[PDB]
Design a protein around this ligand. Structure first.
Ligand SMILES: Nc1ccn([C@H]2C[C@H](O)[C@@H](COP(=O)(O)OP(=O)(O)OP(=O)(O)O)O2)c(=O)n1
Ligand SMILES: [Ca+2]
Ligand SMILES: [K+]
Length: 430
DNA sequence: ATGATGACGCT
DNA sequence: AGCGTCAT
């Protein structure tokens, strides 16, 4: 009752760019706008692997991981943009720079946690308090929320999608207690107003559209963001959680999409996130461990405490290349040449990073994969990163991997290498 | 033969 | 430290 925390103390938003890499290419090439189109890498193998898909192309069934030759059978007029290739490998610089454009806009409104190249969490609790003091009990107009969905509404006693959206919004705003500055529903609503303003600023200053979720924590904000895409935002209130979770497959919740969520399903014999409420904390901790059990117990009630971390920059800068099947590297010279290619791209990104962000990496992680392993990485070893020099980093990487070579012959590499990865880590201010 | 990333938990 | 999970 009066002491049972409800997880309603924060306003958290997740902003996610719609078909991000596609929008980057469509901004650059107007011929691609408003068309079925996809972003591919490496044109030689089956037209390239698709890594991003516009919503027009999704209507034909085009998905990520499709080969472009196969996608073209689903969508013969599919337009494609290729990822840049430099030093024999895909180069994602254009998308990292576009990401920076968005992240810097988002940071004008609140401190962000960069979750990915195209997603950031925002803690809006303080901005909402300030905006509420500026409103002075004044009601919130539906015109301030022109692209907001209220999850779970409309409800109770028009057949077009926007009509539904407005009906639900009207019901929400009619119900709102705007005199209570500490109503969590009011705080979420003001949050949504700010997120409308943030999304409009992103679109105005970059051309990119995004979606967003507004709730009381990161998991609900992420789930909310995906409920109405593209170019929309969804408010998921605490009160909407029981109905929303009652038919929500467990794998949809962030961190349950893999083996842990599969084990929750198998071990407990359930399907939906709401079904977790019937277990005690101790039961869940017995099955999934102390941290996971506590987290599931709170999460299935809509409660989560993972804070929005103040981090706008990536913590690592990595360069990786696969060498599949027949192309696996079998000669020592092949391994040195590719390590140098990776090291040169890494040097260039690190130098840029040190000029922009006043920091230097201090550790070099080298990871390889050998032909035969099912694991994505077969061996990871670190050394000191003391100079931003590609020839030195590639030499050191080779030094810490060269004893993996099973071969008796010096010039050969066995087993051949199917993946090389160089990662700069452990940044220090400078 | 998806591939190229990136964060964080466990021991 | 090195390995694994989960994600974009
Ligand atoms: N397995 C993946 C997932 C994503 N990406 C890249 C390309 C995507 O454009 C971008 C963002 O990924 P999302 O999962 O957010 O997907 P999109 O932004 O493409 O689409 P959506 O509108 O569904 O978010 O990251 C990638 O290279 N490989
Ligand atoms: Ca996205
Ligand atoms: K994303």
């Amino acid at each position: 009752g009066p002491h049972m925390a409800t997880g309603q103390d924060r306003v958290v938003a997740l902003v996610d760019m719609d078909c991000f890499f596609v929008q980057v290419e469509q901004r650059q090439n107007p011929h691609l706008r408003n068309k079925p189109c996809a972003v591919v890498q490496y044109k030689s193998w089956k037209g390239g692997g698709i890594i991003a898909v516009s919503y027009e192309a999704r209507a034909f069934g085009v998905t990520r991981s499709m080969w472009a030759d196969d996608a073209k059978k689903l969508c013969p007029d599919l337009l494609l943009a290729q990822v840049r290739e430099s030093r024999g490998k895909a180069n994602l610089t254009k998308y990292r720079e576009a990401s920076v454009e968005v992240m810097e806009i988002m940071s004008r409104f609140a401190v962000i946690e960069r979750a990915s190249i195209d997603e950031a969490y925002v803690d809006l609790t303080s901005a909402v308090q300030e905006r509420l003091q500026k409103l002075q009990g004044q009601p919130i107009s539906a015109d301030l929320l022109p692209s907001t969905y209220i999850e779970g509404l409309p409800q109770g006693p028009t057949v077009q999608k926007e009509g539904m959206r407005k009906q639900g919004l009207f019901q929400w705003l009619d119900s709102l207690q705007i005199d209570n500055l500490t109503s969590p529903d009011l705080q979420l609503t003001v949050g949504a107003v700010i997120v409308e303003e943030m999304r409009a600023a992103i679109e105005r200053e970059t051309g990119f559209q995004c979606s967003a979720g507004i709730s009381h924590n990161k998991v609900l904000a992420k789930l909310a963001c995906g409920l109405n895409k593209p170019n929309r935002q969804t408010l998921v209130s605490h009160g909407s959680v029981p109905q929303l979770f009652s038919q929500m497959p467990i794998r949809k919740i962030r961190s349950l999409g893999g083996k842990l969520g599969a084990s929750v399903i198998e071990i407990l014999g359930i399907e939906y996130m709401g079904e977790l409420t019937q277990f005690t904390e101790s039961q869940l901790q017995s099955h999934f461990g102390e941290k996971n059990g506590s987290w599931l117990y709170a999460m299935c009630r809509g409660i989560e405490h993972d804070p929005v971390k103040p981090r706008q920059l990536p913590k690592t800068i990595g360069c990786s290349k696969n060498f599949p099947g027949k192309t696996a590297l079998a000669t020592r010279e092949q391994v040195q040449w590719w390590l140098l290619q990776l090291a040169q791209e890494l040097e260039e990104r690190l130098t840029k990073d040190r000029n922009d962000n006043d920091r230097v990496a201090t550790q070099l992680v080298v990871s390889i994969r050998v032909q035969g392993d099912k694991r994505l990485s077969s061996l990871r070893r670190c050394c000191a990163l003391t100079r931003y020099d590609a020839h030195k980093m590639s030499h050191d990487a080779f030094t810490v991997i060269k004893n993996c070579n099973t071969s008796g012959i010096q010039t050969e590499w066995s087993p051949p290498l199917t993946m090389l990865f160089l990662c700069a880590t452990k940044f220090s201010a400078s």
